[model samples]
Target: SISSQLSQWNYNNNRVLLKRSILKTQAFMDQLQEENNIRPIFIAANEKLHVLQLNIKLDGQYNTKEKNGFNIEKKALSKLFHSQIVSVTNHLNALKKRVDDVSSKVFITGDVNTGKSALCNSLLKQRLLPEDQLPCTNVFSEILEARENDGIEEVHAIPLNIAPTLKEAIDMYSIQNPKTYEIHTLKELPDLVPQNGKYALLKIYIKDDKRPASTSLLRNGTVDISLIDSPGLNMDSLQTAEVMSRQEEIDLVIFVVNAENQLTLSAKEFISLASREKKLMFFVVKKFDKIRDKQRCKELILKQIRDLSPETYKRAADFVHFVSKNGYSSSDPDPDFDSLEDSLRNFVLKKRSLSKLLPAKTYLSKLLSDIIMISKSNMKMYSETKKELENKKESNLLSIKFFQSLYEGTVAQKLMVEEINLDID
Candidate 1:
C-alpha cells in the first residue's frame, strides 16, 4: 500500500514538470514569432523543399510512423526542416541589415565610352576604377569605402554559386571569406573583369583619405554611399537580368550622357524605363568640352529630357549638369560638377525614408505575407492528416469491443454445460 502511494505521488510530480516545460517552450516560440523579425516556419513548403531536395533527397514516406520507417530517415527529414528555417532566418537578418543600414547605392549607367567610370573616379577623387581609352569595364564595379569592410582595402569577386538570390547575398556577402575570390591589391582588379562569365560581381573597397568626411561621397559621416559603375546596357538577357535584380537596391541613378553622342536608342529606352520605375533621376552630360555648339547641344538634350520625363525637365537646372571629362580632377573641380555632387548628396541624405526605408518595408511585408500563406496551407494539410488518424483509431477500438463480447459469450456457455446436460437427460 505504501509503495503504491509513493508511485502515485511521483507520477503527479513528473506530470507537473512536463506541463511547466511545455509552457516555457510555447513562450519561447511566441517571442521568436514576432511580426518585425523572424516569423515561425510552419511547414516546409514546395518552394523551399525543392531547394533542399536539390542537396538532400530521401525515398521515405512523408508520414514516418510506420513499422518499416527508419530512425535515420526521420532524422534526415528533421534536418531538412531545420535547413528551411535557416533560410528564412537569414532573410530576417538581411531585413534587419536593410532597415538599420544608413547607406545608399548610386548606379552610374550609360552608353559605352560615355565616361561612367570617369565620373565615379572623379567623385572619389582617385583613379581607382580602371579607365582606358577603349571600353574597359565589362562588369559592375561596386565601389565602397574600406571603413565599411572594417578598414580593409581589398576586392570581393563574387562567383555565381555563392547565393541563389540577391536578397540572400545581401547578408552572405557582408563578411568576406576565402569563399569569394579576393584580391588584396587594387592593381589586380582590372584583370578580374572582362570576366567572360567567370564572376557575377566585383566589390571594391577603397579608403577616401584625400578628402574630409563632410565632402567625401564614400566616407560621408551621415550616410555611407556606394558607387556602382554598370556596363552599357546590352539589351541582352544577362544585362537585363542583372539590372532587374539590382532595381530594388539601387537608391539613385546618375545617367551619364555624352554631349557629342546625345541620347542613343539604349539611353532613351533606359531613361523611359527608369522614369516609370524610379521617383527621381539625374542626368550628367560628360565630354561637353569637346562640343563646338554648347548651346545647341544643351537645348537638344533639354528637349529630350522633356520628352522622356517632364518631372526631371521641370527641375532641369538642378537635375542636369554638364561636365568636361578632358583633364578632369577633383582638386580643380568644375563648378557644375560640384553643384551636381551637392544635389546628389542632398537627394540621398534627405530622402532617407524613400530610398532606404520604403524598399525594406515593402520587401519585408511581401516575405511575411508569403510565409503566412505557406503556414495556412500547411495547417489545412495537417488537419486532414489528423482526421485520418482519428478515424483509424476509432475503427480499431470498435473491432476490439466486438472480440471482447464474443469471448464473454463463449465462456458463459461453457460454464452452464453441466447444468444444461442434467436438464436434458
Candidate 2:
C-alpha cells in the first residue's frame, strides 16, 4: 500500500529522474540474484519458510511449520558499501600526495662576525644592517619581500631572538674591555619613514656617556633582502653555547677573518665544530688590503687555512678577500676592490637561483589540479549511490510503514501511518 502511494506521488515529483535511476539499479540486482539461484534476489516483505518432516506413525499426510528466514539483503548492500569506502580512500590519498609535495624553507648561517650580513648586502646591493664593529650587530634579523599598502613601501624585519639584549649581546664578543650597554625596545616605528632617514636606534657609550644614534636605511627597491648579524665569535665566553644553537638556522656561512692575524686556537676550534654540524661555510679573508705584499699575504692565508682544515678547504670555492673597514674611501680604481666585488656578486647570484621553485604560478597550478581530481571522483560516487537507493524504493517504503504501525497502538496508528506514507511518497 505504501509503495502504491509512493508511485502516485512520484508522477508529479521534480526528482522523477533520480528515482527512476534507483529503480533501474534495483531491477538489475533482482535479475542478478534470480540467475545465480532459485531464491529471489530480494524479499518484498518479511516472510517465514520451512521444509516439512514426516513421521509415518503420526500421520499419513505430511504437515509443515514455518520459522523466520535469514536476511539475504547484506549481499546486495556490499557493492554500494564498498564503493563508498573506495571513494573516501581515493580522496585521502590525493590529500596526502599534495601535502608531501610541499617545499621546505632553506637557511644560510655561520660563526659570529662572519660576513653573513655583508655577503647578503653585497648580493642584494642593499644595506640590511649596521656592520660597524665586531659586536655592533646584536639581534638576529631576516629580510624578505617588502609589503605594499596604499602607495606605501614596507619591508619585513622578522626578528629572531639571536641574543637577549645589547648588553647581553656585547658580552658574547671575545674582545677585551667589554663595554656596558643598554637595550631599546623600538615599538613606535611607523610603517613608512623618509627615504634618506635612519630607521634603527642603538644606545652606546661615546666619551664615557651613553648616546643614541640612528642606524636605519633609506627605502630602495633594488634589493629585497635582510640579514642576521651576530656578535663576533668568542670561544672563551659562555655565549658560545647560544651561538651553537643558532647555527641550526643558517643555510650558508660566510666566515670573515683578518688576513694579518693567524687563525687563533679558538678560530680553529670553531671551524672544526661547525664542520661537524655539516654547515656549508666559506672563508672571507678580511683586511687583505692592509698587507703591503697582497699576493704573498693571500697565499699565506690560504696555506694556513688549508693546513688547518684540508677537507673544508677542498670543499669551499676559491677564498674571498675583502677590506670591510676602510676600503670604500680608495679613489683610484683599486684592483683589490674590483676583484672582491666581482666574487661577491657571483656568490649572491648563486643564492638567488633557489627562488625558482617558489613562484606563485607554479604553486597554484599544482593546488588546482589536486582539487579538480577530488571533485570529479566524488561526483561519480554520488551518482552511483543515488541510483542504487532508488531501485529498492517500493519494498523499503512498505517495510518501514509496517514497522511504524506495529510500534504504535491502534488509536495512534492511523496518524503514524499517514506520516510514514507521506515520507515514502
Candidate 3:
C-alpha cells in the first residue's frame, strides 16, 4: 500500500490532520504567490514526502553517531557529513524541478522540430513523445510510473474552458505540453483519476500491471528527476518564464539542433543566455546520417558555433556530437547516440555526488571547532601541572639541607661535652 508522508514523520498519524496542519503553515502561505499572482505555485506531494523520508534518515544517522561515537578523523568526518549534505541538497534539487527523487528533470530546448520531440522519444526509446509516440505536451508532461490501480493509459490535461470537454481542448489548442498533464478541469473531469478536491488539476495516469523496463539512468524503476520538453524558447509568456528561470533551477540541459538547418537564430539567442549561465549544456545535431560526409557535418556544426559565437561554444566541456534520433536509441552505435547518453550520465552523476561537498563542509566545521576546544583545555591542564611540580621540587631541596645541618650540629655538641668531662676527671 502507498503511504502518506504525514504518517511517516512523527508529526501525525492520520493523513487528514497532516493535510490540515500543512495547509496552515507559513511556507504554504508563501507558496501561494497569490498576493500579486492569482494562481498557487503548487508543491508536489511526492517531494514533501521524499524530503520527510530523507530528514528522518538524516536524524537517525546523527542519533546513531551520537549514541555510538564521533571518534572519527577529520577526513573521515568530512566524508560522512558530505553524505548527509548530499541527501538534503539532492532533495532540494528535485524540488526545483518540482518532482520526486526518481524524476530527473532534463529540459529539452531548441528551435522547433530539430527532432526535439523525437529526441524525447528516442531518449526513453518510448514511442509517441516526439510527435512523441508518449502522448506528450508542449508545456510539460511528467512521465512517471503508474500504480497498479491507475489507468492503463491516459493524458491528464487542462482545457481552456470548463464548458468544453478536455478532449475538445486538447484538439482545440494543443495544451498537453508540460507534464501537468498535471493540471485539471474547468467544470467536470472524467473518472480519469480518483479525486474531487484535486479536480481543478489534471493528472494523467498510464497504468500498466506488468510494469515496464527502465533505462540505466533510472534507479529502482523510478527516475529521480524529470525531462522538461520545451516546444521552443522565448516563444510565449510561459515559455519565456521557463527558459529564464530554468537556467538557475534545472540540473542540466540537452539542447537538440538540426544537422541540415545549422544554427537557427533562436538557438543562437538561447546560446547567449546559456553561455552566460555556463550550466551543464549539450549540443546534439540530429539527422546526421542525412549528410553522407559525417566529417563535413562535424566541421559544419563546429564552424557554425565558432562563427556564431566562440564564447558560447566554450561554455560546455563536452563537444558537439552527430546522431540520428530516428530509427535508434541513444544506445546501439549505428551513430554515436550512446556517447551522448554516456556524457549526460557522467555529468549528472558527478553533480549528484558533488552536492554532498557543501553539506560536508558544515559538518567538518563543527568537528574542527570541537577539536579546538578540547585541545585548548588539555593545554591549560599541562601548564597548571608543570607549575605545581616545579614548586614542590624547591621545597624538597630546602628541607633536606636544613635536616643535614641540624644532625651535624648535634654531633659537634656531644663531642665537646665528652672532652670537658674527661679533662675534669
Candidate 4:
C-alpha cells in the first residue's frame, strides 16, 4: 500500500500542500527515500517539491499591506501584490489558500443513437445515464465530481438561475412521468430531468474514486471539471449567436457520430455552433468495426465530415484527439469504451490543466514583475537613503503610473461586483 502511494502523490494537483505535508513529516519521507525501490519516486517527487517550495515563497512575498516603518515606494508596489483582483479573493487560511474552485465543462454531444450518453455511463462506470433505450434527453446534464460520503446518487434537477434563493430540486426518478409533454410543475428544481422536447440544462454532482487527480496542470485539485452530456441537436440547440458570440457556455465539446456525415446535418449545425462560438471542439467516430474495411469507413467518414465543414474535419483528423471504439461496438459499455474514454481523459487533463493552472501562473507572473520592482525599491531604501532622493522624481513617476494602473483595475472590478450586489436588491 505504501508503495502505491507514489503514483497517487504524482497525480495530486495540489503539490504545495502535498509537499508541505511530505516535508513536514521529513522523517517519514526520508525513510521512504532510503529504500532503493522508492528512491526513484522520491527523486521525481522531490524535484516537483522544489518547485512547490519556490512557489510557496512567492506567496509569502504577496501584498500583505504590511509596513514595518515602510516607505512610499514599497507601499505602491504592495498594492499590486496585495490588492485583491476580480476573480481572486483573499485567502486567510495560509495552510490551504490555493484550494479555490477550478471547474471546466466537457460537452458530450452528438446525434441520437451515437452512444454519446452510453459513453458517459461507461466513463463514469455506472448505468445512471439513459442509453439507446432512452427515447430522449430533454435537457443538458453537467456531471461534477463529488465526495464518497456525500451520498450523491443518480441525478438531481438543478435550480434555475433566475431565483435569488437556493431552492431544493426534485429527483428525476421520483417523478410520476418526467417525459410527459403536458407536465409542467416548475423551474427552480424538478424531481428529475423532465423531458418535454424543450431545452434546459441540469447539473449532476458525481465524484470519482479517491485516487490523486493527475490529468491537471496544477498538482492541487481545485479546478472544477464538469462533463456536460448535451442532448442531441434535434432537441433544439443554440439560444444564442446573434448578440452574444464570444460567450460560449461550454468550454470543451466532444461530438459523437454513429452515422454518415451527410445523414446528421444537425451534428454539423452543432459543429457550426462550436465554430461560431469559438470553443474547443472534437469529433468521435463510433461503430467502425461493423464495416469490413476500416479504410473505406474512414473515407466515408472523412467525406461526410467534409460535407459538414472541411476545416473542423481537418482539425479533428489532424490530431490524435479524434477517437472511436472498435473492440466493443455499442453492446457492452465498458470493454468497448477503452479508446474513447482514454481520449476524453487525455483531452481533459491537458485542457483543464491549461484552463486552470495558466491563469494563476500568469497572474502570479504579472505580480512577480511588480514584486521585483518593489524589491528593488526596498533595496534602494536600505542601500543609500541619500542617493534615493536624487532619483526620487523619476522613480516616483514610474511607481505612480504602476500604482494608478492597479488602482484603476481594482476600482473597475469593484464596480462590477457592485452592479451584481445592487441587482440583488
Candidate 5:
C-alpha cells in the first residue's frame, strides 16, 4: 500500500551512478599520489584531491570491502581486513539509520483569499511569512534546515530546479516589472523586502532544539521535513501560471476553504486540476472559529462538496481529511479543534511512514550502494595508474645511469679541452 502511494523515480538511480563515477575517479587519483612522490604542490590540485578523497569516504567505498564476515582465522592480516570491513559496515549502517528518518515537504495551497499563509505560520509556530488582507506574500516559499556557528546563522539553500521555460518566463517578467517575480532562498532573504507578484522559496533552518512536530532526519544530513507556502490559488492569473509551471513536482495539495462561503468556481477548478494530477488533496475549513456548531457546519460543507463533484467526494472519502487553521492561542475554544489537530497530525505522520517504507529509504539505499561501488572501482584504477608510474620511474632511472656512462666516455674529453682553453683566456 505504501509503495502504491509513493513511487520511486529514475533520477535516484542516476544519483547513484554519478556518485560512483566520482569515487572511481578519486580512487585513481589517490593511487597515483601514493605511488609517485609527485605530491601535488599546487593548492588547487591538492584541494581537488582532498575533495575526491572525502567523497569516496562519505560514499562508503574505501575500506568497505574489508568488512568482517564468517571467519575462522584471527591473524593480523585477517584483523586488518576485519577492521576495514567493520568501517564499511558501520558506514552502511549509519546510512540505513538516516534512511529510516522521516522528512517531508508539506505544501499548503488554497483558493484566493483563503488564509493559506496564516494557517502555515500557525502550524509552523513561526511568523516567517507576512500575512495581510492585501496578499502580502505572493510566492512559493520553502522552510529549510539551517546551522549556527560562532553566533552567526548560516542557512544552506537546498538546490532545486524549475523548468527552463518557467524560469525564463519568471525572469523576463521580473526584469520588466522589477517586482513581478523574485527568487529568494533563505540565505538570500536577509536584505530583501516584500514585492508584488514575486515568488521565492525561503529555507528556514531548524536547529535540533527547534525541530517541529512534522520534522524528520534524512541519511543525507538534510532535515526530513520541509514546509512550502504557496500563493493562494485564486489570487489571479499569475498564481495559476506559477502553479501550472510547477505542477509536475507537487506532491500534495492542501486546499484551504472559507468556512462560511460555499466553494467558489475557482476553488472547484483547483480541486479538479489537482485531481487530474492524481495528487493527494485535502480541504481545510479555515476560520472555523467564525462559525458556531462546527460539527454541523462541517457536515453541511462535506455534503455540498460531494454534491458538487462526485469524483472529488469519492476521492476525499478515500484520501482526504479536514482541519481548522487556528493559531496556537484560542481565546474561545471549540470542542472539536483539539480532535481535528490530533487527527491531522496522525494523518501527516502516517503519510510520512508510508513515504519512508515505499520510496524514500529504498531510493537512498540504492544510491549509496552504487556510489560505493563506483568509488571502489575508481580507487582500483588509481592504484593501477600509480603502478604504471612507478615502473616508468624505474625505467627512467636506468636510462639516466646509462646516459651518464656514455657521456663520461665520449663527451667528457671534449668538455675538458674546452674548459682548459677558457681558463687560459
Candidate 6:
C-alpha cells in the first residue's frame, strides 16, 4: 500500500520551498537596487593575449556603449523599484497603526434637542452631562472609561484659541500631555461645558463602577468603546458638518430621534447622507413615554428607518430601540432600554474585529495585491532586459574572437612565405 503520510510530507516540503522562493525574490530585488551592475565575462586562455585583444576591441569602444546602456537601464529600473517599495512600506506602517488601535468609536448625533444628551446619560446610567429642554451641548464631548486615562475621572477641554477647527482640536488634546487641554473634575464639568463656542471639544473620562464588565458599555473586555456626543445638526450647521466629516474615523453612529416628532427634515437628511455610504447604524427613539400613540409612533419611525436604511430596518428588533431616556435615574426603568444596552454590547463585542481590524485588513489586502502586481511586471521587464544585454555581450565576444583568429592566421602565413623566399634566395 502507498504511504499517504509520505505524499503529504512531499506536499508540505513543496510549500516550504515555495515560501523560500518568495523570500529569495525579495532579496534579489534588494540586491538589484543597491548593488553595482553585473559585468559579463568569459573564461581566459592565453591571458595576456586575450587581455590585449579585449582592450583593442570590446573594452575600448564597444565596452563603453554596452556598459553605459546597461547601467542607465539598471539605474532607471532601480529608481522605479525604490519608489514602489517606499509606497508599500508607508501603507504597511499605516495598517500597523490601525491594527494596534483596538478601540471602537461610537458617534451619537441628531437634530436640535432630540434627546441626544439624554440618550448619552441613559447609556452611561448616570446624569453625567447637563441635559436641558433646549440645546445645551455647544461643543463635541467624547466619553471614555476612566481606565483609558489611568483610572481618573476628569475632563480634557480643548481651548478654542489654540485649535480653530475641530480636526485641529482633536489633534491637540491629550490625556498624558497636560499642555493640550484644561483639566477639570467631574463636579466642575457642568459649569465648564456650556460656554457657547468657548472650547473646541471635551474629552470626558468617567468611571462606570455600577454595571458589571459584561453589561458596561465603557469597560467591556474585547471592545474599548468611546461614546462621542455631537452638537445638534441644525444648532451649528458648520460645526455639525465637521462632526459628520469625522464619521469616517468612527465605528458606529447612534442616531437619536424624538418619538413625538419622529424623523424631522434635518434628521431625514442626515440619515439619507449617512446611508449613501451603506453603514449599519443603531437608531434610538427617545421620549417614548410622552408619546400617547406609541404604536403609531413606532410604525412611523420604523417606516422612516426602512426608507433611509433597509439593512437597519430589516433587523429593527436589534438595531432600533424605542425607550424613554428620561426618568431612568429616578422612576421605574424602561425594559426596552435594557434590550438596547444588551444589543449594543453584543454588536460591539461580537463584531470587535469588524470595527477594529477590518479597515486595516481591507487596506492591507489591497496594498498586497498591488505590490504583487507591480513587482511581477517590474521583475519581468528587469530580467528580460538583463538577459538581452548578456546575449549581446556573448555575440560581440564571439565576433571579436573570430576576427583575432583570422588576423593571426594571415600573419603566420605571411611569415612562412617570407622564410620560403629567404630559402629561395
Cα TM-score per model: 0.58, 0.37, 0.44, 0.44, 0.45, 0.60
| Candidate 5 TM-score, true structure as reference | 0.45
Clashes of each: 0, 14, 38, 19, 15, 0
Count clashing residue pairs in model 2.
14
lDDT of 6 by residue, 1-425 (tens): 14334433443343343233334333433433333234222212221220011121334455534533233333455444455455334433433433445577888988878888888888888888878787677778889888878988888888877775666777777776776788888777667667646777788998888667767788776567899887787766676676666554565789998888889988886776555333468898887888888888879999989988887898898899987657344576668888988888877766544334433333333333333333333333333389798887675555344334433443443333222110110
**Candidate 5 at residue 68, lDDT?**
33
> Judged by lDDT against the true structure, how good is candidate 5?
0.45
lDDT of 4 by residue, 340-371 (tens): 55555554443443332222332232333332
Task: Residues 1-425, candidate 3: write the lDDT tens digits.
Answer: 12323212321122232222223222222221221132111111111121112122343354634533334443344344335434433333423232112234566677665666667555655553536333223444334334521434555554335424332443343333553234333222223222322222233333223323433543324225455555555355545544555543444567788777777777776765544323235788887778777777677778877755464366434546677657333334554666776666655543332221211222222322322332233233323399897866565454334334333433443333222210110
Global lDDT of each model? 0.61, 0.37, 0.43, 0.42, 0.45, 0.62
RMSD of each: 23.3, 28.9, 27.1, 18.3, 24.6, 23.5
Q: Which stretches of candidate 3 lie over 4 Å from their true place?
A: 1-103, 130-137, 147-153, 158-215, 219-223, 233-249, 292-296, 303-319, 327-335, 353-425
Q: For model 1, where is the 10-residue window of minimal lDDT?
A: 416-425
- What is the per-residue lDDT of model 5 for residues 1-425, given as tens digits with 9 covering 90 to 100? 44423323322333343334334333432333332222211111111221112221333445647543333332333333334334333333333333333455456777666777776666554555567666555656655544322223333222223324444443344222433333344444433323322323434444433344334221124224556667676666766766654432444455678877747777776665444323244567776668777788778778866754464466564334444554344575543434544444544444433322222222223333433343344333333389798877665554344334332432333232222110110
**Superposed Cα deviation of residue 402, candidate 3 (Å):** 75
Leading candidate by TM-score: 6
Ten-residue segment with the worst summed lDDT in candidate 3?
Answer: 39-48
Model 6 spans > 4 angstroms off: 1-100, 327-333, 353-425
lDDT score of residue 286 within candidate 4? 67
